[PDB]
Design a protein around this motif. Structure first.
Motif, PDB file in Angstrom:
ATOM      1  N   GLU A 179     -19.179  19.635  74.021  1.00  0.00           N
ATOM      2  CA  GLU A 179     -18.517  19.064  75.192  1.00  0.00           C
ATOM      3  C   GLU A 179     -17.671  20.085  75.958  1.00  0.00           C
ATOM      4  N   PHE A 180     -17.572  19.946  77.260  1.00  0.00           N
ATOM      5  CA  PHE A 180     -16.933  20.953  78.085  1.00  0.00           C
ATOM      6  C   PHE A 180     -15.494  21.232  77.725  1.00  0.00           C
ATOM      7  N   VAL A 181     -14.690  20.208  77.442  1.00  0.00           N
ATOM      8  CA  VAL A 181     -13.280  20.487  77.097  1.00  0.00           C
ATOM      9  C   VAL A 181     -13.171  21.297  75.810  1.00  0.00           C
ATOM     10  N   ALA A 182     -14.011  20.990  74.816  1.00  0.00           N
ATOM     11  CA  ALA A 182     -14.080  21.804  73.590  1.00  0.00           C
ATOM     12  C   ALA A 182     -14.492  23.276  73.851  1.00  0.00           C
ATOM     13  N   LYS A 183     -15.480  23.456  74.719  1.00  0.00           N
ATOM     14  CA  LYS A 183     -15.944  24.784  75.087  1.00  0.00           C
ATOM     15  C   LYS A 183     -14.834  25.540  75.790  1.00  0.00           C
ATOM     16  N   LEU A 184     -14.067  24.825  76.617  1.00  0.00           N
ATOM     17  CA  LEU A 184     -13.018  25.499  77.365  1.00  0.00           C
ATOM     18  C   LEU A 184     -11.873  25.920  76.433  1.00  0.00           C
ATOM     19  N   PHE A 185     -11.437  24.978  75.605  1.00  0.00           N
ATOM     20  CA  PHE A 185     -10.455  25.239  74.551  1.00  0.00           C
ATOM     21  C   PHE A 185     -10.875  26.426  73.657  1.00  0.00           C
ATOM     22  N   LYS A 186     -12.131  26.427  73.194  1.00  0.00           N
ATOM     23  CA  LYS A 186     -12.649  27.511  72.372  1.00  0.00           C
ATOM     24  C   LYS A 186     -12.657  28.862  73.072  1.00  0.00           C
ATOM     25  N   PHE A 187     -13.028  28.896  74.351  1.00  0.00           N
ATOM     26  CA  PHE A 187     -12.932  30.129  75.101  1.00  0.00           C
ATOM     27  C   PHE A 187     -11.511  30.739  75.043  1.00  0.00           C
ATOM     28  N   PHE A 188     -10.484  29.938  75.299  1.00  0.00           N
ATOM     29  CA  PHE A 188      -9.153  30.456  75.344  1.00  0.00           C
ATOM     30  C   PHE A 188      -8.616  30.841  73.951  1.00  0.00           C
ATOM     31  N   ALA A 189      -8.961  30.036  72.935  1.00  0.00           N
ATOM     32  CA  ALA A 189      -8.562  30.394  71.573  1.00  0.00           C
ATOM     33  C   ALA A 189      -9.276  31.682  71.139  1.00  0.00           C
ATOM     34  N   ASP A 190     -10.570  31.801  71.461  1.00  0.00           N
ATOM     35  CA  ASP A 190     -11.274  33.076  71.207  1.00  0.00           C
ATOM     36  C   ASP A 190     -10.657  34.272  71.957  1.00  0.00           C
ATOM     37  N   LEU A 191     -10.393  34.088  73.247  1.00  0.00           N
ATOM     38  CA  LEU A 191      -9.754  35.129  74.043  1.00  0.00           C
ATOM     39  C   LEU A 191      -8.416  35.606  73.416  1.00  0.00           C
ATOM     40  N   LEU A 192      -7.560  34.682  72.986  1.00  0.00           N
ATOM     41  CA  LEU A 192      -6.314  35.054  72.276  1.00  0.00           C
ATOM     42  C   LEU A 192      -6.607  35.788  70.981  1.00  0.00           C
ATOM     43  N   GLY A 193      -7.621  35.322  70.239  1.00  0.00           N
ATOM     44  CA  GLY A 193      -8.027  35.964  68.995  1.00  0.00           C
ATOM     45  C   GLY A 193      -8.482  37.395  69.162  1.00  0.00           C
ATOM     46  N   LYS A 194      -9.001  37.744  70.325  1.00  0.00           N
ATOM     47  CA  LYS A 194      -9.336  39.140  70.620  1.00  0.00           C
ATOM     48  C   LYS A 194      -8.136  40.104  70.646  1.00  0.00           C
ATOM     49  N   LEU A 241     -10.877  47.814  76.872  1.00  0.00           N
ATOM     50  CA  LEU A 241     -10.029  47.602  75.679  1.00  0.00           C
ATOM     51  C   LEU A 241     -10.772  47.568  74.341  1.00  0.00           C
ATOM     52  N   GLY A 242     -12.091  47.468  74.392  1.00  0.00           N
ATOM     53  CA  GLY A 242     -12.933  47.456  73.203  1.00  0.00           C
ATOM     54  C   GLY A 242     -13.021  46.118  72.520  1.00  0.00           C
ATOM     55  N   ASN A 243     -13.964  46.056  71.600  1.00  0.00           N
ATOM     56  CA  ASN A 243     -14.158  44.906  70.735  1.00  0.00           C
ATOM     57  C   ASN A 243     -14.013  45.231  69.238  1.00  0.00           C
ATOM     58  N   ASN A 244     -13.742  46.497  68.908  1.00  0.00           N
ATOM     59  CA  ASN A 244     -13.635  46.936  67.515  1.00  0.00           C
ATOM     60  C   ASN A 244     -12.541  47.979  67.361  1.00  0.00           C
TER      61      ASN A 244
END
Lengths: 22, 22, 22, 22, 22, 22, 22, 22, 22, 22, 22, 22, 22, 22, 22, 22, 22, 22
Positions: free
Chosen positions: P2-17, R19-22
């Motif tokens: 679902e789109f809201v889940a995909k959007l949430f996941k994008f931002f949590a992934d982006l922070l995780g980077k 910024l890289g990925n690794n």
């Protein structure tokens, strides 16, 4: 899973990323 | 599980994450 | 207010949101 | 279990988490 | 108020929310 | 068990958690 | 008031909530 | 057992918890 | 009032709540 | 046993708990 | 009043509650 | 046993608990 | 009043409650 | 406000966004 | 504002863009 | 998803980077 | 503005160009 | 892949070049 449960779980998981579970 | 029980359990679990159960 | 009282009050308030006080 | 019993048990259990049963 | 009195009063009040006092 | 007996037993048990039975 | 009197009064009051005094 | 006997026995038992029977 | 008198009076009063005094 | 006898016996027994029978 | 008189009076009064004095 | 005899015997027995029979 | 007189009077009074004096 | 209270309030507020307070 | 609060607020705001606040 | 889940996941992934997951 | 906030804002703005804010 | 995902991925990839990925 019902939406309110999914939403609650997202935020509890998000906090767990900072404070841990172990 | 009935909603009020689920809600009560969420909050008791959430507190248990901070204060422990053992 | 002492913590056990605060905790008790939270849960009684939470139930009151569902079942009312009047 | 009847609701008033379940509610009573929740609060007695919650106190027992702080003060113990043994 | 002494703790056992406070505890007793909590439960009598909690029952009164369901069964009333009038 | 009749409700008044159950209620009486709850409170006598609750006191017994603090003061003991042995 | 002495504790045994207070305890006795609690239970007589609790019964009076069900059966009345008038 | 008749209710007045049950009530009398409750209070005599309750006192016995404090003062003993032996 | 002496304890045995107080105890006797409690039980006579308790019976009077059921059977009356008038 | 007739009620007046039962009532009399209760009070004589209650006194016997304090003063003994032997 | 001497204890045996007080005890005798209690029981005569208790009977009088059932059978009357007038 | 006739009631007046039973009543008389109760009081003579009650006195005997204090003053003895031997 | 001497004890034997008091005891005698108690029993004569007790009988008088049943059979009367007039 | 203490962290556990803030956390509890977040989740109760979040539920209130779905179920309302009025 | 503390980082966990800011992060929580971002996601609650993001959901509010889809589901509204009024 | 679902789109809201995909959007949430994008931002949590982006922070995780930036902050990592391990 | 801190870099993670700026990055988050870029993507939320970019989505807003497609889905709107009003 | 949907256009908003493709657009998001372009920018996250572009940042990753710096910024890289690794």
């Amino acid at each position: 899973m019902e939406f309110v449960a999914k939403l609650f779980k997202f935020f509890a998981d998000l906090l767990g990323k900072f404070l841990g579970n172990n």
